[PDB]
Structure 1
Amino acid sequence: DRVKRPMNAFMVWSRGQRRKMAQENPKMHNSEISKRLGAEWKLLSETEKRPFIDEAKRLRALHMKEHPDYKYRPRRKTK
């Protein structure tokens, strides 16, 4: 299988709100959701973010342990 990128603080946090907005407000597109979470996040205090930034660290550590040789290789799509 292909190795995904580890989640950053924002991706971890948004993962939460995503449901608490998607189920709460269906028929709404992830696009609009992302836009919203986006805005909400840039409004959190370094103290409100701290736990997700911290959990992101562990996820990053977890990723290396489970993929010691993984190197991110984004490939310029064909176009």
Structure 2
Amino acid sequence: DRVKRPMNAFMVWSRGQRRKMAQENPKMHNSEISKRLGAEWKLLSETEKRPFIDEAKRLRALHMKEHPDYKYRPRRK
């Protein structure tokens, strides 16, 4: 079982926002939704984004508690 990296504020915010857009836009391909979400995500303010950054920060600290020795080791091509 490999450990996956903690989800960042955008990935966490997209998990719930991505489903919201799919229910309202269930025929839109993720390729286009991913583009509109990025456009909408860039329009949020820091105060509004803060609540999502803190949660990613908490998920990162809690993720670190589960695997305190985990290290990000990307594969070089």
Q: CA deviation at 1:27?
A: 2.4
Indicate the structure with greater helix content.
2
CA distance in 1, matches of 2:50, 2:42: 13
Q: CA deviation at 1:18?
A: 0.4
Structure 2's unaligned 5+ residue stretches are: none
CA distance in 2, matches of 1:32, 1:42: 16
TM-score of the two chains, using structure 2 as the length reference: 0.91
Structure 1 segments of 4 or more deviating over 2 A?
none
TM-score of the two chains, using structure 1 as the length reference: 0.89
Please list the CA deviations of residues 15-38 of structure 1 after superposition, one character each: whole Å capped at 9, or x if unmatched. Answer: 111011112211221111111111
Question: What's the RMSD between the two structures over aligned residues?
Answer: 1.2
Please list the CA deviations of residues 34-63 of structure 1 after superposition, one character each: whole Å capped at 9, or x if unmatched. Answer: 111111111101111010001011000011
Equivalent residues, number:
77
CA distance in 2, matches of 1:5, 1:33: 23
